[PDB]
C-alpha cells in the first residue's frame, strides 16, 4: 500500500538546483546591491518566510524582479540561496555575521539558530 | 565548510506540496482523460523525464495545459503526482499495473521497477 522513497526529496532538490544552474524555468531575479541572482519563486517560498509573504501577496506575485533591502549584502544572500538549493550552508568566520542577519531578514529561523551555534562554538 | 540539513530536502518538498494544495504559483494544468491536475512545471521536470522534455520543448514550453496521451489513466497519474510531491507512493492491487504503466510513460524508472517488483511478489 504505502512505499516511501527516502532519497526522493533530495533527488528533487538536486534536480531543481541543476535547473537553476542551466537557468531553466527561473522566473525571478533577486537583486541585492545590484548583484543579480536568478531563481524559482517556489523554492524561495519553500525556504523563506519573507519570500513566502512576498510571493503570496497578489500585488507582487508576478514581479519578475525583487530588490532586497539596502542593508542586505550580496555574499550573505548567496550563501543562503545555495543552502536553499543544496541543503549545504557554508559558514565561515568571515561571513558568519552577514549570513545570520540575512537569515533573520529572510525569516529562516532554523538557519538563524545554526549561525548562533556556529558563533557560540568556534 | 559544509554543514548538513538532512531534513532540509524533505522540508522543501513538504512546502512545495503545500503550495500545490493552495494552488499557489501552479503554472500548468495536466490533463489526463478529462481530469485536471494543477501543478508546478519545475516539480514535474525534477521528477519525470517526459516532463523535462515537454517543458524545454520549443513547441510546448509555454503552454498552460498539457494533454497526456489518451491511453494514460487519471488515477494512475494522480498517484504518481502525489508521489512527486511527498516521496510516498500509494498503491493497491487494483491500480498498481496502471500506476506502473503511467510511470513508464512519465519515465520514472525507479518507480516503474518498484512497481514491477511488487507485482511479481503479488
Curated annotation (Swiss-Prot), chains A, B:
Q: What result follows from mutating residue 15 to K?
A: Abolishes interaction with NCOR2 and HDAC2, no effect on interaction with CTBP1 and transcriptional autoinhibition
What is its subcellular localisation?
Answer: Nucleus
Q: What is the effect of changing residue 110 to A?
A: Abolishes interaction with NCOR2 and HDAC2, no effect on interaction with CTBP1 and transcriptional autoinhibition
PTM remark: Phosphorylated by ATM in response to genotoxic stress. Phosphorylation induces its degradation by ubiquitin/proteasome pathway.
Q: In which tissues is it expressed?
A: Expressed in germinal center T- and B-cells and in primary immature dendritic cells.
Copy out the induction comment: Down-regulated during maturation of dendritic cells by selective stimuli such as bacterial lipopolysaccharides (LPS), CD40LG and zymosan. Protein levels decreases upon genotoxic stress in a dose- and time-dependent way.
Q: What is known of its domains?
A: The BTB domain mediates homodimerization. Its dimer interface mediates peptide binding such as to corepressors BCOR and NCOR2. Interaction with corepressors through the BTB domain is needed to facilitate the rapid proliferation and survival of GC B-cells but is not involved in the T(FH) formation and BCL6-mediated suppression of T(H)2 and T(H)17 differentiationrequired for GC formation.
Subunit arrangement? Homodimer. Interacts (via BTB domain) with the corepressors BCOR, NCOR1 and SMRT/NCOR2; the interactions are direct. Forms preferably ternary complexes with BCOR and SMRT/NCOR2 on target gene promoters but, on enhancer elements, interacts with SMRT/NCOR2 and HDAC3 to repress proximal gene expression. Interacts with histone deacetylases HDAC2, HDAC5 and HDAC9 (via the catalytic domain). Interacts with ZBTB7 and BCL6B. Interacts with SCF(FBXO11) complex; the interaction is independent of phosphorylation and promotes ubiquitination.
* Function (record text): Transcriptional repressor mainly required for germinal center (GC) formation and antibody affinity maturation which has different mechanisms of action specific to the lineage and biological functions. Forms complexes with different corepressors and histone deacetylases to repress the transcriptional expression of different subsets of target genes. Represses its target genes by binding directly to the DNA sequence 5'-TTCCTAGAA-3' (BCL6-binding site) or indirectly by repressing the transcriptional activity of transcription factors.
Disease cited in the entry? Chromosomal aberrations involving BCL6 are a cause of B-cell non-Hodgkin lymphomas (B-cell NHL), including diffuse large B-cell lymphoma and follicular lymphoma. Approximately 40% of diffuse large B-cell lymphomas and 5 to 10% of follicular lymphomas are associated with chromosomal translocations that deregulate expression of BCL6 by juxtaposing heterologous promoters to the BCL6 coding domain. Translocation t(3;14)(q27;q32). Translocation t(3;22)(q27;q11) with immunoglobulin gene regions. Translocation t(3;7)(q27;p12) with IKZF1 gene 5'non-coding region. A chromosomal aberration involving BCL6 may be a cause of a form of B-cell leukemia. Translocation t(3;11)(q27;q23) with POU2AF1/OBF1.
Q: What is this protein called?
A: B-cell lymphoma 6 protein
| Record organism | Homo sapiens (Human)
Q: What stretch of the complete protein does the chain hold? A: 7 to 128 of 706
Amino acid at each position: 500500500s504505502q512505499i516511501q522513497f527516502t532519497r526522493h526529496a533530495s533527488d528533487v532538490l538536486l534536480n531543481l538546483n541543476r535547473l537553476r544552474s542551466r537557468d531553466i524555468l527561473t522566473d525571478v531575479v533577486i537583486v541585492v546591491s545590484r548583484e543579480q541572482f536568478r531563481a524559482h519563486k517556489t523554492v524561495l517560498m519553500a525556504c523563506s518566510g519573507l519570500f513566502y509573504s512576498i510571493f503570496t501577496d497578489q500585488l507582487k506575485r508576478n514581479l519578475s524582479v525583487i530588490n532586497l533591502d539596502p542593508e542586505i549584502n550580496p555574499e550573505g544572500f548567496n550563501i543562503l540561496l545555495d543552502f536553499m538549493y543544496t541543503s549545504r550552508l557554508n559558514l565561515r568566520e568571515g561571513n558568519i555575521m552577514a549570513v545570520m542577519a540575512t537569515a533573520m531578514y529572510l525569516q529562516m529561523e532554523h538557519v538563524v539558530d545554526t549561525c548562533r551555534k556556529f558563533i557560540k562554538a568556534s
